[PDB]
Design a protein around this ligand. Sequence first.
Ligand code: CA
Ligand code: MG
Length: 782
Amino acid sequence: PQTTLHKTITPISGQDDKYELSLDITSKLGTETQTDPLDVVLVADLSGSMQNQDVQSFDGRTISRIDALKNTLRGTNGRKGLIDTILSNSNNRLSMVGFGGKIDNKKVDQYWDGNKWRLFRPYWPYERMTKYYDGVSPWDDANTILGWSNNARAAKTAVYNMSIAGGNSIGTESGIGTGTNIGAGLTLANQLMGSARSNAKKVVILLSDGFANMVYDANGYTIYNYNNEDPNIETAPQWFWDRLNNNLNSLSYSLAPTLDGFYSIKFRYSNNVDSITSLQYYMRQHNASIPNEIFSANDEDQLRDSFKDITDKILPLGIHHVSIKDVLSKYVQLLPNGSSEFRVVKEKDGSSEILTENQVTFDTKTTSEGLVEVTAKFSPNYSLEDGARYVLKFTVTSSQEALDAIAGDKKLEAGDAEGSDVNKLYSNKGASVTYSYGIGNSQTKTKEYSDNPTFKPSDPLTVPVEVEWQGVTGARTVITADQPSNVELKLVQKNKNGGSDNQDYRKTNVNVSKNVSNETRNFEKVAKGYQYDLIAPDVPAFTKEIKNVGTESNPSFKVIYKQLPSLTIKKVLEAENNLNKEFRIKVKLTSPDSKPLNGTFGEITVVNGEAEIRVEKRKRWRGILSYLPRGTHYKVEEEAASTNGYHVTYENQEGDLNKDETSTVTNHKLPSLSVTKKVTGVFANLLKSFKITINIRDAQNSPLNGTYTATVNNKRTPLQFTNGRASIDLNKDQTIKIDGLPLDSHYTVEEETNSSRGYQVSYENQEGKLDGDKSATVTNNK
Ligand SMILES: [Ca+2]
Ligand SMILES: [Mg+2]
């Protein structure tokens, strides 16, 4: 009648992105019924078999079936009995009826000729010939125990007065008989129901204990089935079956379209012949919409419960056939593996209990739009206690759509959120309750929830990024190289759905100040739910290393720049005179992977791991192979040509470049001997070749051997010394500078005797030690 609908979404505190939806409903009537008076007719088997003492009572005694139902209706000392139940409401009135058949028909006639009686005229298998008895009453196999009455006391007395017929039952005998003529009871019920209030709820409750062994004829005389003379053999001839089905059908045709409900209880049903089944069929044929059920009871307790069930279906607590439904918006989803804890809670006067599986079921359809429909279907018959709170509770989490939205990666459209605020996302697309009030699926109203709740997703992430600049040897060594002025960094978001990764998702630029080695900056509003990586510039002179120092779910990136090492070649000039000299130094460079190197590095270019440095005064006698790969192996050697005149020693000539190295080529100019020929007594001449022998012993006292560079007339020439003797030809006023002679060697100059042809030969510095540049002169006088 009256219903209260409320729905909210409550944040589960200290669980990120988890909420609880609560959809409650509360029933309210006010009084007893919404002025829907009941007209209830009880039809009771009063057959002989219904006095069978074979029923276990609540108190542990076996009593008779009559005795049992005498208690189930009236009530064991004001115990809640069917009578009381129904007539609790003063608008409600009830009629009671008892049925039991008498044998109006004969089996087989015999002939008593004042002597003997043997079978004369058979009737039992009627080929349309049965004869009955005389004076038998038609329509006499049932009586109204109680006409329409709202007087519970009178009814309790009437039940108390219910009793089974006495003697073997012939149609002559008055009152009901001891047979089962179910047709009889229903006939009378139909009559009573015709006098029922035609704006009440007409309900009939049938009760039987065995199969119907009797059928009324068209005239109302009772035909008994003599095939069932043995109670242990329920067997019937064809024509009897026909009449029974027809009678049942006819009764149903008149009753069912007037009834609002029909209920049958087969107490202690024994006969394999099942005819309450047949009744249900015909009833449904003539009214498929009415509640139509058959119960099975074997003891007094089972009878009470089954009776009560009917008094709970016609006489309501409240509302039934209940179903609570929520369609979730795109912005929420259910926890996997039924972790949402779908539960319906009942509020009993403050206190509360969880409805069981037998009270409520849960369903998960995916809807036509493409959203999820949570459906809380209650047991069809479950009635909501008047003024109790039945609340559906379950957990949901933010969808990716929501997580995207709060980061600002998805656009709120129309009615996705309250006032297009991402902190006010709507959790439901729509939600509803369906219920019925009355008997069966009659009223079936659907109210849509008025409330549209809102929630805020978890704060998007702040993904931090640090940039460390390290010098050659590591952190806290000064950087000597040009840094850029800043580096632009870009957060990359790996695409879940396919291949197209977002390489410009967010962006930040980090200032690079010299003399500050650590600087952090942040990417703000990053969406939860994704893996992320970092793009960072390749800075010249440095190596890069990007690493996520955090988690996947909470990234934090660091980028380390470490300056590459470089090799410097210095040349030192011992015996320095000329400053405007150049020297070439070779450097073989084998990179890590033990593979040769290729690239350019300062002003020095590297091919297959070779490189050549030309050093001179204006270059500060230095050359630098800058920012070579870490751990590059190097090996130095001065070029052959440049080792002329000089003894060349070396420092750091080979190693690995893990720090900045300096290799140093020192050069010691070696002594030189110069010999000059001067002539006296002549002026200019062709006869001028004078042959002059030089003897040199090393410092080791050892005769010199091999070739040395001698310049004559600005023309480098090889001079061969053999056993410390060489010879030269000099012209008037010519010199020869023999270069590269060993330090501390000793020399002698003399003139070949044939070349001294009538010449006074004089000498200056004729012998000497070569501790530096020495010079000799030979003079001639003709
Ligand atoms: Ca009769
Ligand atoms: Mg019976």
